Amino acid sequence: DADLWSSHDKMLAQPLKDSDVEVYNIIKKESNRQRVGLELIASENFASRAVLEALGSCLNNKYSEGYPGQRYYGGTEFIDELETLCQKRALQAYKLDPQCWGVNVQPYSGSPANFAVYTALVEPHGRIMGLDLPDGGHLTHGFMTDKKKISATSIFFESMPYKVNPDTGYINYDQLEENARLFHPKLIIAGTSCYSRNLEYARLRKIADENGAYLMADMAHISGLVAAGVVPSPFEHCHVVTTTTHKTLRGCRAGMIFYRKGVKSVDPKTGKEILYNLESLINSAVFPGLQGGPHNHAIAGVAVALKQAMTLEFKVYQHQVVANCRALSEALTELGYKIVTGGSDNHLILVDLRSKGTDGGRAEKVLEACSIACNKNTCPGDRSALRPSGLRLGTPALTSRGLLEKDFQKVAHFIHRGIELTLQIQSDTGVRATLKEFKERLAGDKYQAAVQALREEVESFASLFPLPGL
Amino acid sequence: DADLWSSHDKMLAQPLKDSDVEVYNIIKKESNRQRVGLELIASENFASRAVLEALGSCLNNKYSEGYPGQRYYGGTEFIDELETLCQKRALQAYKLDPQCWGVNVQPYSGSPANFAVYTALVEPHGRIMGLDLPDGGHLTHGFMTDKKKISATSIFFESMPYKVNPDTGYINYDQLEENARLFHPKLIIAGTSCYSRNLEYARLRKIADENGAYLMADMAHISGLVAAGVVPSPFEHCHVVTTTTHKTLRGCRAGMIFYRKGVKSVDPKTGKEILYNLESLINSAVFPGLQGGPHNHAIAGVAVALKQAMTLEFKVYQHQVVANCRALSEALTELGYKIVTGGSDNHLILVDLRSKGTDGGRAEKVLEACSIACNKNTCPGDRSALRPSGLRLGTPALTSRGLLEKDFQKVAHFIHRGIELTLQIQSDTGVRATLKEFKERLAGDKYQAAVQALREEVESFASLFPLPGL
Amino acid sequence: DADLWSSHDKMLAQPLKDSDVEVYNIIKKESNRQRVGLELIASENFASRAVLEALGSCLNNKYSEGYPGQRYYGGTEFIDELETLCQKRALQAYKLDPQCWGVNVQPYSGSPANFAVYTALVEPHGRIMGLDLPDGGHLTHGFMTDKKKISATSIFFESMPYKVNPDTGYINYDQLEENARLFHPKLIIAGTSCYSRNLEYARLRKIADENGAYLMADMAHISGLVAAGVVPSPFEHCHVVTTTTHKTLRGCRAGMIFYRKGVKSVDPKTGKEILYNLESLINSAVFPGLQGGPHNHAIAGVAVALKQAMTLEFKVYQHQVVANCRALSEALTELGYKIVTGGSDNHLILVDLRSKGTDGGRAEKVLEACSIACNKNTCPGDRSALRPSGLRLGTPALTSRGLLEKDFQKVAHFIHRGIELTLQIQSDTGVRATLKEFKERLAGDKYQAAVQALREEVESFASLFPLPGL
Amino acid sequence: DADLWSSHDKMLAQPLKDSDVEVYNIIKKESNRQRVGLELIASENFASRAVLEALGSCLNNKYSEGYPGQRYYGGTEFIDELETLCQKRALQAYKLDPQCWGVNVQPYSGSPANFAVYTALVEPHGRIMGLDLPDGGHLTHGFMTDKKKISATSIFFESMPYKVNPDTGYINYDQLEENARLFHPKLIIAGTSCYSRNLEYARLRKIADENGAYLMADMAHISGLVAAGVVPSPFEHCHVVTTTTHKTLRGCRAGMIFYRKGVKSVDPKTGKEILYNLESLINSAVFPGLQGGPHNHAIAGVAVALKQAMTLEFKVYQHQVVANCRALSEALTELGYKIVTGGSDNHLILVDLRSKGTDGGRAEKVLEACSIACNKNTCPGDRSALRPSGLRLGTPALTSRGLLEKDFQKVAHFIHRGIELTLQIQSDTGVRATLKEFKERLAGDKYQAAVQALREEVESFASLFPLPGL
């Protein structure tokens, strides 16, 4: 008889290297690329090998729609031990009284986390106020132009941004407090994806209370810092805290929603009092509202990343983050670079390349060709969103490998040497000023020797450190 | 000096069993539970070991917002080789002319896939028509009661269901065609999560064209079947096809959106013609619209699951699915069970337990106690959504281990023996008819010997087969 | 000195005939046209001379925003005596316990009345179900095509019609009850603008209660009948009753909103009970919500028309309406005309001209040329909305002049003689079948003698009766 | 035989004084009240006797749904001569090229006019920016609080106000231009109901063009002035002009919508160009969109008021308006009253009563008791919307009777004598400061002699002048 049926059995147990060498090559190619690169993209990091194991496990198989104690099909006994162990670890990592804070750990990624909160607390066409995109706010905090609403947050809800003060570089809280009285937010977003300094959660809570609006923090970018205490915690001031489980938390791609439960209103003559109904609203928006079967294999990685974040090693790792950040920010500042806002209270800095006579658009694509990766970003006071003059560098990714202040100064010198190239390639184009032309001149032969020269040096340096996972 | 810094290095490379035995135990506990259980939940399956490896890899680290050729930060060269290799494999698996079909492989799961399509083609408060929930339609096809809109699809959009014909059990296409003229859909959903038989995509396309509405298929539940050709393909009739990359595709949790590109309108006297603009609309809804950083580690698993689906072994596996399904449906039908619609053209069957004098609510929770898992489900003509009289069993999960027609008949006998228990525990409660009471009587001591008796037998049987992954 | 200032004084007190003969001519031209015409347009009537006087009075001058006891500027003492005298007369005309019914008399016309109710009880995008336009429902009950939402009710709210049964001609309540469970109305409209028979308010209330939706009647077309008791009253079954103050109420153009106040819910174990909050919601939607300064001069006319409606003369006038209607419907039925539904329980009838081999489109424009005016209307079972085969005739307008059953039979003979012409002009066009061609052939010379012949006869008849107002 | 049928005939032709003396008394009571009162309410006026005649005429009877050339039932031949004669007169009154301006004259009142424009150009939830309510903007320009959206404009659309500068009293155009870039208006409202000075339509058009938003003027309050040229015309800068046909136009309660037709875009290399499609959108929103049967009797009055506005007498009447306004504003300013903004360029002034130590709330209700009527109004820089410290006086109403600068100075002295009373009644209450208490103390006996003293004097003065209409 024709028995490829015992072969089909083999295919399900065949290892990756054998089943599909094509993606096995793509993976081991990327693994190499990561190890020979100085990763300065602020939102990057290298996930623990304990997280990567839990990620791909038989946990991938169980559908477990619902929540513990409200599952829908029989089999959710060990997936229940997990989801409650995970959200239990979360509430510990940030030292929250479980009777004052609940958490939902099902959101698929960060953006899906934020959107679920709006669905649960704002309702369609409710007004939302977040930091403007070019001033350092994430897409899901609202983004829309004269012509079209671009971010889903702006499509299904009515958003209006509040901006940073271009003279100082800090959030303009006075103008927010003022415009809020004209816009009437229902929920204010206290979060950023490219802000050097701390948020005045204390003052944002006052603005939200005066307008009758929820205050939700999007600590995705500083979740790791907040957890180690290296940055003041948004929990004592916010009604809801959304977070990405990666970036500075070194977990797998996922997201969580912290929501205060307990008592909300006083009523000093009514006797009885109001209570936070955030638990039911948020959980009902995640499911049956927006998602389906939770990614139990992702909750596993989040659970182990949360334990890893409550360690002592993790505490000092985050302190090195902020230290390596200022160590870098200082080195560039000494070299004559304008660091937006003057410095940083967290893991990233926005350097305004107009102090050296270039823009982040051209500088980004030349550093990349040298195996040091980052991203452009508009600066407070930028004259056009098309020629952004800023680069956003962050430590967490590199410092996760072992880099120290001493080392990050070498990283700042390599960076500068990259800008030295950008200025040269820009002087050649000069009069003929077009990104397509600049993009080509670099790929041209004249500089293909100079870029290779700096590229050899940066990779020889990056190779000296470890790379968690492989 | 205090050097826990070389220890922090160790923590990132420490294996799961050592870093966090607590979740390592939870995982190896679940792995065992899966192997000793007869999994009949229609939407389940066991993922390939090649998929589980690609899942947890260094691919987890790279943020790659955008698409190939429209990334935003430097580093997306190997993530580009992947995303285009993946969507290339997709278009092959279903044998679609790339010049007539595009695909987007970033959606986080199934539900996020569907919602992205509505955002891109329907816009807020546009009307949508999907199969009713209790008649076999997924939550994201629209669900709302007199009181509150429950599914996000029904919150941000205006939905109205079309129902199955309770006398036959088949979709009532005549009533759909009729009500559509009163409701004016903008998009009709041709998909199910609990339907025994095939969809008349041919006729649903006619209804949509007569009302000027997109026709989108949600083949999540039969993606594996459609790909092996064991069930007619919705691609020759639909404008968009959303799909879950698991269930009958045996991949990791993720989702895809197939969209027709090319030429839409004729204009036999205008000369020039209209073109499908679905590519830009759908891609712009996924990003920058609803999602953020794609889960490149999930696209890896989808890529290897797509190659695995184009094999010959996969083709015969799906044929065994449909065969084991009728082999089971027949056995129960012979035993006197009412199989809704009479049988099945795909991998699952809805059996109406009113033919044996019980309901799926009580039967579900007793089979689960016997280590054979499934889920209740309302039947065409059910008198109340609280006492659902149907169970939804599907082969794909078990047949993925090696079960054959011969074996599935043994699975049908074990099942029946479960209903024999349900009827007994129900006769004791009898007059005193409450689920809480029935739930307790089973956990009681009288039957805790009888359940254990049948449980030993079902686990001894399930243990005889493999379990892909470990 | 140049004193055109005592002349400006004259201009404000100059009579119409002197100030602007151009509109004085237009008015006295129309006055004549009305007197020499057999007015059968169902929604027409001739306003009392006591209403027309109150209409144009110094009441036009006072701005009186708000309500009695909630005005905003000083001066509303006599405008208050009016608005409360008016709404007092309203509640009497329909014999409603003021402690169970409130009324708002500010709405500018009928349509503005209806829209205010939706704004107050439904809120944006709440679902509404009204009789379909071509089946005899007013525009403001919802109207929208595949392409665009046309009626404001359908733009700001989500509407879906319920249809008449083409085999019988009556509202298909069984299908409404059924579809309502799929659509989930929030407010059901029990009103028509072209329906021969009575509404089953009793049954529409049951459908609304089963779906949790308000039931509002739009008795604009039978307000006069309901008030005289010649047709069952929608007040014992509806939550809200909107009405036009003209048509069968013989008032000036305006509108009112009747709303039940009092107790709504029971709670046979809670003790306390819910109360109808319709008064505040409706009044707050009219103002400060949708309108501004009330038209106090229109409320004056409504007040005198309400007193006129509570007379004995008004009671018999309405009885003659229903009598003259059947007297006419019978005459045509005897002549071989298909009267939709068989007859009428109210003041109008829809005659299906397909029984004589023509359509209302061509018949309308020929009767008009003969000085008998009416309007086309689609019939239950019409094959295209472009060639409507129905005419809608109503008595109230003509019977308001003095016509009796005897006379209305002469009106039915004149009408038929009009259709005799339509058939001739249609046979000439025959093969070449186009409305533009038919429209021309009538204006042509061949028939311009035959139309004038019948026109002389109809005007000689219409001139014999009075014309209230001049 | 019982013939009350010839009596019913009498009732329709019975005069008002006989049919319903109750409203005949209410009318002749109000007529008297108007003649013995100094009317300073800014939005008031006395309608011409030629307008009041046309108002109540047989024109009330004809239903004429649609527009000229798009009516729906036969009979609209003289109603067509009117509606096109009327809109023809409109386009003349403001000297607009008919090929560059269309007009719609059906809107029922002012508010219904504005709302129709939003429906036609903005669509639901499109953003609108109007002058804030307390800063001198009408309700329909948008009004909403933290808690509830109050104005229909704010319910169905998303509005955000722009404010007056409290230090100067003028509109803060710099802040508008700035916030507009954050809010992204779709339509900016250049109109006021309580603004002393002229609008910078020139600058508001620039702000709207920079944001891609329509600029619509709401000249309801200065329609009469604009028409006589006593105030710069918004037509050379706006896309749409809505207007009330009363207030300074001395017509009957109604409204109009001016909309530019012609060519909108350039395309200096495309050749062909875009065209203003405002005509179809606006007309389709009025009908079949929001309204029903036009009030042909109101269009008649508007037509005669438009002819009356194109006279020479009307031109000088408006010049006397602005003259009597400054004559009054000057007199109070000399007396030590703070006139908001310093003076007025139009027919009204906002006087800030804090310069005399009182508030408009208490002053309004005492002047009313003295037969001089006006309304309170918040002042730029008011500390609470509950104790508004401003009164809004306007000339047009009184000057319409014959008052001159000389006379208006006597009106300013009477006014002051009213504030002298308010201060006394306020000193008695003093410590015990409550409006209910102040309201009572005035109605009390102590001052009922002093109020009567000033009341005799003001009525003896007001009686000396005419009163158009009776």
Answer for the pair C197, C136: CB distance below 8 angstroms, yes or no.
no
- Does D62 fall in a domain? yes
The two tokens of residue A135 are 């001033």
Residues of chain A that touch chain D, judged by Cβ-Cβ distance less than 8 Å: 125, 127, 132, 144-147, 158, 160-163, 179, 182-184, 211-212
Pairing mode, strands C127-129 and C158-159: parallel
- Does A256 fall in a domain? yes
Q: DSSP characters for B70-109?
A: EESSTTTTHHHHHHHHHHHHHHHHTT--TTTEEEE---SS
Q: Which of A138, A237, A239, A246 is catalytic?
A: A246
Chain A residues whose beta carbon lies within 8 Å of the beta carbon of residue D158: 125, 127, 158
Radius of gyration of chain B (CA): 24
Comparing CB atoms, the residue among C30, C308, C466 nearest residue D19 is C308
Q: Examine the domain organization and report whether A65 and A152 are in the same domain.
A: yes
How many other C-beta atoms are found inside a 10 Å radius of the C-beta of residue C431? 4
- Does D260 fall in a domain? yes
C-alpha neighbours within 13 Å on the C-beta side of residue A42: 26
A97 Cα distance to chain centroid? 26
> What are the beta bridge partners of residue B377?
B390
Q: Do C211 and B146 touch (CB under 8 A)?
A: yes
CA atoms of C392 and C415, how far apart (whole Å) = 12
Catalytic residue numbers of B read 194, 246
Q: Do A183 and D160 touch (CB under 8 A)?
A: yes
Chain C residues whose beta carbon lies within 8 Å of the beta carbon of residue D154: none
> What are the beta bridge partners of residue D241?
D217, D258
The two tokens of residue D52 are 């009041």
Question: Could you tell me how many CB contacts below 8 A there are between chain C and chain D?
Answer: 358
Distances (CA, A) of C422 to A77, B346, C275, D74: 80, 61, 58, 15
Number of folded domains in chain A? 2
The two tokens of residue B218 are 């949600």
The two tokens of residue D379 are 């002042």
Q: Examine the domain organization and report whether B354 and B242 are in the same domain.
A: no
Comparing CB atoms, the residue among D144, D146, D160 nearest residue A211 is D146
Single out the residue of A381, A394, A391, A396 nearest to residue A422, CA to CA: A391
CA atoms of B252 and B248, how far apart (whole Å) = 11
Comparing CB atoms, the residue among D144, D147, D182 nearest residue A161 is D182
CA atoms of B68 and B87, how far apart (whole Å) = 11
- D466: exposed, middle or buried (C-beta count within 10 Å: 0-12, 13-18, 19+)? middle
Answer for the pair D150, D92: CB distance below 8 angstroms, yes or no.
no
Comparing CB atoms, the residue among A4, A156, A288 nearest residue B124 is A156
Q: Examine the domain organization and report whether A261 and A382 are in the same domain.
A: no
CA atoms of A39 and A31, how far apart (whole Å) = 13
Q: What single DSSP character describes residue D139?
A: G
Cα distance from D182 to chain A (closest Cα, Å)? 6
Answer for the pair D402, D463: CB distance below 8 angstroms, yes or no.
no
Q: Examine the domain organization and report whether D75 and D107 are in the same domain.
A: yes
CA atoms of C206 and C278, how far apart (whole Å) = 20
C166: helix, coil or strand? Answer: coil
Answer for the pair C307, C388: CB distance below 8 angstroms, yes or no.
no
Q: Do B111 and A292 touch (CB under 8 A)?
A: yes
Pseudo-torsion of CA C439, C444, C450, C453, nearest 10°? 90
Final residue of a domain: which of B257, B287, B309? B309
Q: Examine the domain organization and report whether D143 and D283 are in the same domain.
A: yes
CA atoms of A327 and B129, how far apart (whole Å) = 58
C394: helix, coil or strand? Answer: strand
Catalytic residue numbers of C read 194, 246
Chain B residues whose beta carbon lies within 8 Å of the beta carbon of residue C146: 184, 211-212
Single out the residue of B263, D17, B85, D247 nearest to residue C53, CA to CA: D17
Identity at C424, one-letter amino acid code:
Q
Chains linked to B by 3 or more Cβ pairs within 8 Å: A, C
- Does A302 fall in a domain? yes
Residue of A nearest to D124 (CA): A125
Q: Examine the domain organization and report whether D353 and D432 are in the same domain.
A: yes
Q: Which of D246, D295, D297, D347 is catalytic?
A: D246
Length of chain B: 470
Answer for the pair A206, A237: CB distance below 8 angstroms, yes or no.
no
Beta strands in C196-285 (DSSP E): 214-218, 240-244, 255-260, 262-263, 275-276
Q: How far apart are the first and last CA of chain C?
A: 43
Answer for the pair A447, A425: CB distance below 8 angstroms, yes or no.
yes
The two tokens of residue D259 are 């909309």
Backbone φ and ψ of C418, nearest 5°: -65, -45
Answer for the pair C205, C234: CB distance below 8 angstroms, yes or no.
no
Q: Which are the contacts of D10, defined by CB distance < 8 A and separation ≥ 6? A: none
The two tokens of residue A270 are 């009514």
Q: Where do we find the tokens 């040497």?
A: A417
Q: What single DSSP character describes residue A151?
A: S
D417: helix, coil or strand? Answer: helix
Pairing mode, strands B255-260 and B101-104: antiparallel
Residues of chain C that touch chain B, judged by Cβ-Cβ distance less than 8 Å: 125, 127, 132, 144-147, 158, 160-163, 179, 182-184, 211-212
D228-256: b or e for each residue (b if 16 or more CB lie within 10 Å)?
A: bebbbbbbebbbbbbbbbbbbbbbbbbbb
- Does B228 fall in a domain? yes
Residue of D nearest to C287 (CA): D151
Residue of D nearest to A163 (CA): D182
Q: Which helix (H) or strand (E) holds D191?
A: strand D187-191
- Does D353 fall in a domain? yes
CA atoms of A25 and C39, how far apart (whole Å) = 87
Angle value at C-alpha B301, between B298 and B302, nearest 5 degrees: 85
Q: Which helix (H) or strand (E) holds C388?
A: none
Q: Examine the domain organization and report whether A95 and A232 are in the same domain.
A: yes
Q: Which are the contacts of A132, defined by CB distance < 8 A and separation ≥ 6? A: A161, A162, A163, A164, D182
- Does B13 fall in a domain? no
Q: Do D146 and A182 touch (CB under 8 A)?
A: no
How many other C-beta atoms are found inside a 10 Å radius of the C-beta of residue B251? 28
CA atoms of B44 and B399, how far apart (whole Å) = 11
- Does B49 fall in a domain? no
CA atoms of A353 and A115, how far apart (whole Å) = 34
Distances (CA, A) of D470 to C15, C54, D48, D314: 11, 12, 10, 20
Backbone φ and ψ of B419, nearest 5°: -65, -35
CA atoms of A55 and B61, how far apart (whole Å) = 13
- What is the CATH classification number for the domain harbouring C379? 3.90.1150.10
Final residue of a domain: which of B258, B277, B309? B309
Comparing CB atoms, the residue among C146, C163, C179 nearest residue B212 is C146
Residue of B nearest to C179 (CA): B179
Radius of gyration of chain C (CA): 24
- A203: exposed, middle or buried (C-beta count within 10 Å: 0-12, 13-18, 19+)? middle
Cα distance from A311 to chain D (closest Cα, Å)? 44
- What is the CATH classification number for the domain harbouring A160? 3.40.640.10
Distances (CA, A) of B140 to A139, B137, B243, B381, C249: 24, 8, 12, 22, 50
D81-120: b or e for each residue (b if 16 or more CB lie within 10 Å)?
A: bbbebbbebbbebbebeeeebbbbbbbbbbbbbbbbbbbb
Answer for the pair A292, A108: CB distance below 8 angstroms, yes or no.
no
Q: In what order do the strands lie in the sheet with D348-352?
A: D338-339, D348-352, D390-394, D375-377
Single out the residue of D217, D209, D200 nearest to residue D265, CA to CA: D209
Domain limits for position C335: 320-462
The two tokens of residue D281 are 């959108």
Q: DSSP characters for B228-247?
A: HTSS--GGGT-SEEEEESSG
Q: DSSP characters for C282-339?
A: HHHIIIIII--S--HHHHHHHHHHHHHHTSHHHHHHHHHHHHHHHHHHHHHHHTT-EE
Answer for the pair D376, D360: CB distance below 8 angstroms, yes or no.
yes
B163: helix, coil or strand? Answer: coil
Single out the residue of A137, A306, A330 nearest to residue A228, CA to CA: A306
CA atoms of D234 and D204, how far apart (whole Å) = 10
Answer for the pair D196, D350: CB distance below 8 angstroms, yes or no.
yes
Answer for the pair A416, A355: CB distance below 8 angstroms, yes or no.
no
Final residue of a domain: which of A282, A309, A336? A309
Pseudo-torsion of CA A443, A446, A451, A456, nearest 10°? 120
Identity at A80, one-letter amino acid code:
D
The two tokens of residue C118 are 């939706």
- B34: exposed, middle or buried (C-beta count within 10 Å: 0-12, 13-18, 19+)? buried
Single out the residue of A218, C20, A51 nearest to residue B56, CA to CA: A51
Q: Which are the contacts of C2, defined by CB distance < 8 A and separation ≥ 6? A: none
Q: Examine the domain organization and report whether A334 and A243 are in the same domain.
A: no
Single out the residue of B140, B345, B328, B329 nearest to residue B225, CA to CA: B345
Q: Do C147 and B212 touch (CB under 8 A)?
A: yes
Answer for the pair A449, A365: CB distance below 8 angstroms, yes or no.
no
Single out the residue of A126, A232, A144 nearest to residue A188, CA to CA: A126
Q: DSSP characters for D297-360?
A: HHHHHHHHHHHHHTSHHHHHHHHHHHHHHHHHHHHHHHTT-EETTSS-SSSEEEEEGGGTT--H
Single out the residue of C361, C369, C329, C335 nearest to residue C458, CA to CA: C369
Q: Examine the domain organization and report whether C283 and C346 are in the same domain.
A: no
Q: Examine the domain organization and report whether A101 and A218 are in the same domain.
A: yes
Length of chain D: 470
Q: What single DSSP character describes residue D199?
A: -
Q: Do A146 and D184 touch (CB under 8 A)?
A: yes
Length of chain C: 470
Q: Examine the domain organization and report whether D298 and D355 are in the same domain.
A: no
CA atoms of B411 and A266, how far apart (whole Å) = 60
Distances (CA, A) of A112 to A293, B7, B72: 14, 35, 20
Backbone φ and ψ of A419, nearest 5°: -65, -35
Residue of D nearest to A130 (CA): D182
- The technique by which this structure was obtained is X-ray
> What are the beta bridge partners of residue D191?
D218
Backbone φ and ψ of A230, nearest 5°: -80, -5
Q: Examine the domain organization and report whether A229 and A146 are in the same domain.
A: yes
